[PDB]
Amino acid sequence: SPAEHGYYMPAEWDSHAQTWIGWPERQDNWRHNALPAQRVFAGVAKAISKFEPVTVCASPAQWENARKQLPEDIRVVEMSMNDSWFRDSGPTFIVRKRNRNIAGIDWNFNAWGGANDGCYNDWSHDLLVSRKILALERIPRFQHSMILEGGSIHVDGEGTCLVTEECLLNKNRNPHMSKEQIEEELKKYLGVQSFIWLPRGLYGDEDTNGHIDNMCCFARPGVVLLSWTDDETDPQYERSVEALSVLSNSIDARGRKIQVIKLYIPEPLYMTEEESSGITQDGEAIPRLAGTRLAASYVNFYIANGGIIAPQFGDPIRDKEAIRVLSDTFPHHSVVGIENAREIVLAGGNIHCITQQQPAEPT
């Protein structure tokens, strides 16, 4: 019903009031009692806080630890969560030009595929994250019954929505809805007019089922960054070539062809034994096994007000080249490389997955 009052999802490069981030904890997903991941989340929050306000949300047991680790100008609030992926469990904010001029969408959530296919067995706290954030900020809430995660949608703020079929059409999401029915809900809720459907996401992203935000994103209207490799023996290659083909046959909501900038993935990363042994083994979440291909891409960066927060994976040549490409692509932003982003990818995500932008409310 956001179409009724002229709401739309702005592009991520439009002005933010603040960024929301969770705080990692669970010992069956985050190694060494999540301490290495905590230092990286703190580093991401601090980096962003140079550009715009940040609120970090931490569990009751973690609140003091978070407050101690984070700069004073970063707000720390108590919140229960099952895990710390606010891109996906937090609200998708929408605005209008004028009662209020901002709202948040609270989508249904099922831990990326639910009882049979999801990443963990209990998502009851995550179900409340969006409501709690919006209640805290006194921003109106639109609830939707469809299962959706913010990491599965990208917009250019000019009417186009970029998505994957792997995720949005998956049997573990909304199998009762056709492609056209899904598009219809996204038009009404995000204020978009047209879609670009990539068939697949990044190789190795079986746990999210191929979220767009680890595969391809907008840099500006008519221009995307695409995860790329020239190595034809990498299972990523066929996905990248297929996506490029689809993009070359796509037109955006304003009638533009799409320019594609290749953003080369790191050389293949595989979880080590020291890494896998630091994680508790039982049956509340998916097993983390030694030798699994890490789903790493530089495309999982976050845009803040005048800043680009980008991962660094410990691949010397590809890390520096990603910074060069991103600096060239966003010449009016400052690019900041986040070391030890590998610590987030071990848990199945990256910088974009841990953030949720709150747009500035228009006046």
Place this chain on the structure above:
Amino acid sequence: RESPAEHGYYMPAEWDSHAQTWIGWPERQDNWRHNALPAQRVFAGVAKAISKFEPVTVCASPAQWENARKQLPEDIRVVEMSMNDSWFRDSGPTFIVRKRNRNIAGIDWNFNAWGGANDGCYNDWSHDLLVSRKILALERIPRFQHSMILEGGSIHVDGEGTCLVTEECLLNKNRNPHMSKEQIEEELKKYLGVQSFIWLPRGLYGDEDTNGHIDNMCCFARPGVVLLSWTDDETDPQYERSVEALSVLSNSIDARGRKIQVIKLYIPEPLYMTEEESSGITQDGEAIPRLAGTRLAASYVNFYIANGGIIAPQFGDPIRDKEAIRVLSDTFPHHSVVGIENAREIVLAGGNIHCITQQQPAEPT
């Protein structure tokens, strides 16, 4: 360890303009009968009444957040916060303001559940220790920490230099036994911006467990004027306390040089916990006993002042309930007096409306 006095701050009176009111949410079964359901309804009643005057935020534990959110109308903000019990007057911050870094700050006093390991009301106050910091963090308001144990219900101010307190509470060996009266005054001058003190020896009869907070005994109606808990029945143990307090007040001069005027606010006829009430409480030995026959510490002085409103208890004594509304209405002719029914449900757990609230002053421009 810089003092509020250094930065220009003082505690404004409760009748000055608020940005919002903060309230906790009751839960624990060894203090609140029938799984806290009766008490939740009265807390919700208080929040709704205040919400007609000014914004309200209710804080509820992780396990209660959904129940609170469903119970309360959406114009009341509901936030998740861990707590050992729901007495935000005492565990929440004491806000202070200045004329001209923000023009509002909060004091985060030390806390020990009203007397500590040997004389306190429950055995674990770990979450309560963090309530003030969490509230101030939520609002991005600067924090002044104090190592002295103090509850907001133990102090009252007129916003004009006077502080009203009880000896029973602040000089108790269960609070700050290594501080003298003079040392306590000096800290309160620095932190609240006060210059003079009115010390009543004792608080209300029946308030043994919290050691006689001023806010259940006597408060300011306006600068120079106090409301005093009163009875004319000389067989009630309350009588000697009321008479003693009146004597002190009658010889008191406030910070601006006014002789204090006293308005008597008559307590209800003596109220006692019933067997039905007591039997609804779990006896787990983490909290103090709640026994049938106990005198309830009930006084109409334990009201809250909101922007244009007075939120006052009704205890079920129909004569004294009506008289208290009459007195309050006469005393606050520019406020709307609202009576909260079933306030007895709060008093069964040792407090009342003033004890469950914490005002956040408007920040001066």
